[PDB]
Amino acid sequence: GAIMLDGKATRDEIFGDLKQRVAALDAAGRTPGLGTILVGDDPGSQAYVRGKHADCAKVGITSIRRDLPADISTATLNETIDELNANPDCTGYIVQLPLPKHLDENAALERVDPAKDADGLHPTNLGRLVLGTPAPLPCTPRGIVHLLRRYDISIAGAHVVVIGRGVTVGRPLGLLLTRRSENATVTLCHTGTRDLPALTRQADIVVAAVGVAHLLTADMVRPGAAVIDVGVSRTDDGLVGDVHPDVWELAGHVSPNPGGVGPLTRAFLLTNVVELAERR
Amino acid sequence: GAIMLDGKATRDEIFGDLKQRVAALDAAGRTPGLGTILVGDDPGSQAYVRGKHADCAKVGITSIRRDLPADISTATLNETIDELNANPDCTGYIVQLPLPKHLDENAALERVDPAKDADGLHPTNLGRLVLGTPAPLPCTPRGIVHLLRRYDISIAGAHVVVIGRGVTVGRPLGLLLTRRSENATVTLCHTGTRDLPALTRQADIVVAAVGVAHLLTADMVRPGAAVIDVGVSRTDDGLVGDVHPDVWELAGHVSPNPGGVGPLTRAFLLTNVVELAERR
């Protein structure tokens, strides 16, 4: 049976580090604050934002909320974005998605100041990742790499097969893993890929982030290989990951879904906020 | 023998298209202008900038030059950047590298307005490429894809092995080829890669962009495969590409070096400028 990549225990470890580092920022009069912009009342969006602020409260990060009605204008969204940009207690913030359809989501995301981009998803910071300039990194790719290293799985020289090209996971992950400080070989796969199994069988690490229930099966995985389960989709049975349970037999390591990468995404949101405050 | 991917003939074809499109912009009172910032007097830098403006003159694009002495201050560079940013005849511009060492190159590159980023290398536009928002694309990756398509080589479903992780070729190329509109599978290789030949032998398309003289040999290439020669390094014999001449025997297609991708990079610089003007 594969070793369980315990994301919850890893997240708790990060929280404890963050709490000390936030206490040190607080002592210097530099308490970090997380802002959130939430438009309307989608119950899932509400629950995500609650969760982020509850985690902030656990580590001592101030909560700044901008809760707006579903019918705001573009100018009202922009005023809020501009205000958070100029707000000296807001060290970083996120815009909760999805936005009401009368609102240009992407324009809103670009208007965010990249110096306050807690998600690490502003195009300017993603471009900086392409170019090798230090800047906020996207939370999920970053937690995937941290989880692997936490268990002493080698990254340098590894063949990583990434299944999925999502703008917040697959695509930025390929850029992160090919930096000299990581130094993995990456094959980027997706729905346009011919003969996926032949590629996954070569991989030391498989990252399944495509959102197709149990797509990755035992016959596609090299024995001993590390398997990261990121994608989630809805089936008749509820929410299911991208990795078939049979993979656990011969894989060396598997991150569970839930309780694997999900908690690391959240840890690195708070890590980004703390680091933005420390970088002054 | 492999089919020769004739970049010069392809570039000339693009120039002819651009000249007509520039004549149409001119007729609407919207003549495009290319700016260049050149600091000091490096002879190669001088020759590149001359070449870009000579190509502009061929197609009817106005030349805007900012030729600065090697000893300017940071504030003087910034004034020039800000001026080109606000210059209504400057539709796009480039900063010629390298800059004198007392000057922060990257800060200068970020200060450029991404709406005038003729090179497609501003971090904001590279982030937009990650995110799938339309924006200027980097010239070399774009010309590599155009050259392949010009010869009816399939991109969708292709396994592309990219050798090299340069910020202006390898890294952005991996992002470009994995868009749905391209839809290739990409393995990103580099000096950290274990057993490169085993990966290149799988490839339908090999892009050699690492700058290691004749690194790619016949035994590493699948018969019938398309080979793109981008890298250049200095040996005792002068300047040499990344592909060994023996590859020509069994490859289906090879771009020469010189006369392959080099001319396409230049064509897509002018294409970017023309498109920025057309997009209004």
Side-chain angles (χ1 to χ4, degrees):
Chain A
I3 297 173
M4 220 246 304
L5 301 171
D6 193 344
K8 294 205 282 278
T10 305
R11 172 209 55 211
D12 292 338
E13 202 173 39
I14 286 162
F15 277 26
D17 178 46
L18 262 24
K19 187 176 173 186
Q20 296 167 29
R21 291 161 65 172
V22 164
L25 281 164
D26 195 283
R30 300 195 286 156
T31 306
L34 173 77
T36 52
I37 300 179
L38 178 71
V39 185
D41 63 27
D42 179 76
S45 297
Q46 285 183 347
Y48 284 129
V49 169
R50 258 210 311 281
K52 287 160 204 210
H53 285 303
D55 290 337
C56 283
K58 284 182 179 92
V59 299
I61 293 170
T62 306
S63 285
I64 302 174
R65 283 192 162 246
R66 301 290 176 263
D67 299 312
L68 311 177
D71 57 56
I72 52 156
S73 64
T74 289
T76 295
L77 186 51
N78 290 349
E79 280 164 28
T80 300
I81 287 162
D82 293 340
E83 176 265 314
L84 291 185
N85 286 347
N87 189 323
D89 285 350
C90 179
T91 130
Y93 69 99
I94 61 87
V95 181
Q96 186 67 224
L97 262 25
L99 260 27
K101 276 65 225 301
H102 68 285
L103 297 167
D104 190 354
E105 267 191 15
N106 192 64
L109 304 168
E110 296 198 349
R111 198 181 180 98
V112 171
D113 186 343
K116 299 205 172 181
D117 167 35
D119 270 345
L121 294 173
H122 187 102
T124 308
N125 294 144
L126 287 166
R128 285 164 171 159
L129 169 57
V130 179
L131 293 176
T133 132
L137 257 12
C139 305
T140 303
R142 207 182 166 193
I144 290 175
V145 173
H146 180 94
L147 187 55
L148 293 162
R149 295 181 151 143
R150 185 62 186 82
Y151 286 75
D152 284 334
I153 295 150
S154 48
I155 309 295
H159 193 172
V160 186
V161 162
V162 177
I163 316 169
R165 48 174 158 198
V167 304
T168 71
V169 187
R171 283 166 78 70
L173 221 216
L175 299 162
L176 184 62
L177 286 168
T178 55
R179 300 189 306 177
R180 283 156 193 82
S181 59
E182 272 70 33
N183 215 17
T185 294
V186 177
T187 113
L188 300 155
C189 299
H190 44 70
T191 55
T193 294
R194 175 193 71 239
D195 201 2
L196 176 68
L199 298 166
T200 56
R201 283 176 203 125
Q202 303 171 232
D204 304 298
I205 304 179
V206 182
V207 180
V210 70
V212 172
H214 295 168
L215 194 234
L216 189 68
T217 67
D219 67 299
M220 293 167 66
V221 177
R222 172 175 83 69
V227 172
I228 298 289
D229 191 349
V230 187
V232 172
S233 51
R234 182 157 282 278
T235 186
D236 290 327
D237 322 335
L239 301 171
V240 176
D242 292 349
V243 181
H244 196 105
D246 283 3
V247 165
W248 283 88
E249 278 283 4
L250 295 169
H253 296 82
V254 184
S255 72
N257 195 175
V261 165
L264 272 314
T265 294
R266 179 66 55 78
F268 279 99
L269 173 62
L270 302 214
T271 296
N272 276 3
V273 170
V274 172
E275 284 170 354
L276 285 166
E278 288 169 344
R279 309 170 221 180
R280 271 133 33 236
Chain B
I3 297 173
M4 220 246 304
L5 301 171
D6 193 344
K8 294 205 282 278
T10 305
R11 172 209 55 211
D12 292 338
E13 202 173 39
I14 286 162
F15 277 26
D17 178 46
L18 262 24
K19 187 176 173 186
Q20 296 167 29
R21 291 161 65 172
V22 164
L25 281 164
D26 195 283
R30 300 195 286 156
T31 306
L34 173 77
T36 52
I37 300 179
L38 178 71
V39 185
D41 63 27
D42 179 76
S45 297
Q46 285 183 347
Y48 284 129
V49 169
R50 258 210 311 281
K52 287 160 204 210
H53 285 303
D55 290 337
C56 283
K58 284 182 179 92
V59 299
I61 293 170
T62 306
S63 285
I64 302 174
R65 283 192 162 246
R66 301 290 176 263
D67 299 312
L68 311 177
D71 57 56
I72 52 156
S73 64
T74 289
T76 295
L77 186 51
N78 290 349
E79 280 164 28
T80 300
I81 287 162
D82 293 340
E83 176 265 314
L84 291 185
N85 286 347
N87 189 323
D89 285 350
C90 179
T91 130
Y93 69 99
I94 61 87
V95 181
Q96 186 67 224
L97 262 25
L99 260 27
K101 276 65 225 301
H102 68 285
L103 297 167
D104 190 354
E105 267 191 15
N106 192 64
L109 304 168
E110 296 198 349
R111 198 181 180 98
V112 171
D113 186 343
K116 299 205 172 181
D117 167 35
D119 270 345
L121 294 173
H122 187 102
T124 308
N125 294 144
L126 287 166
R128 285 164 171 159
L129 169 57
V130 179
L131 293 176
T133 132
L137 257 12
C139 305
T140 303
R142 207 182 166 193
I144 290 175
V145 173
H146 180 94
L147 187 55
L148 293 162
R149 295 181 151 143
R150 185 62 186 82
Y151 286 75
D152 284 334
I153 295 150
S154 48
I155 309 295
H159 193 172
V160 186
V161 162
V162 177
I163 316 169
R165 48 174 158 198
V167 304
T168 71
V169 187
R171 283 166 78 70
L173 221 216
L175 299 162
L176 184 62
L177 286 168
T178 55
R179 300 189 306 177
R180 283 156 193 82
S181 59
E182 272 70 33
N183 215 17
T185 294
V186 177
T187 113
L188 300 155
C189 299
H190 44 70
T191 55
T193 294
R194 175 193 71 239
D195 201 2
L196 176 68
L199 298 166
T200 56
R201 283 176 203 125
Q202 303 171 232
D204 304 298
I205 304 179
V206 182
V207 180
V210 70
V212 172
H214 295 168
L215 194 234
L216 189 68
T217 67
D219 67 299
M220 293 167 66
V221 177
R222 172 175 83 69
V227 172
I228 298 289
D229 191 349
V230 187
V232 172
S233 51
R234 182 157 282 278
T235 186
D236 290 327
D237 322 335
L239 301 171
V240 176
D242 292 349
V243 181
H244 196 105
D246 283 3
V247 165
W248 283 88
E249 278 283 4
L250 295 169
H253 296 82
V254 184
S255 72
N257 195 175
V261 165
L264 272 314
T265 294
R266 179 66 55 78
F268 279 99
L269 173 62
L270 302 214
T271 296
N272 276 3
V273 170
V274 172
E275 284 170 354
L276 285 166
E278 288 169 344
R279 309 170 221 180
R280 271 133 33 236

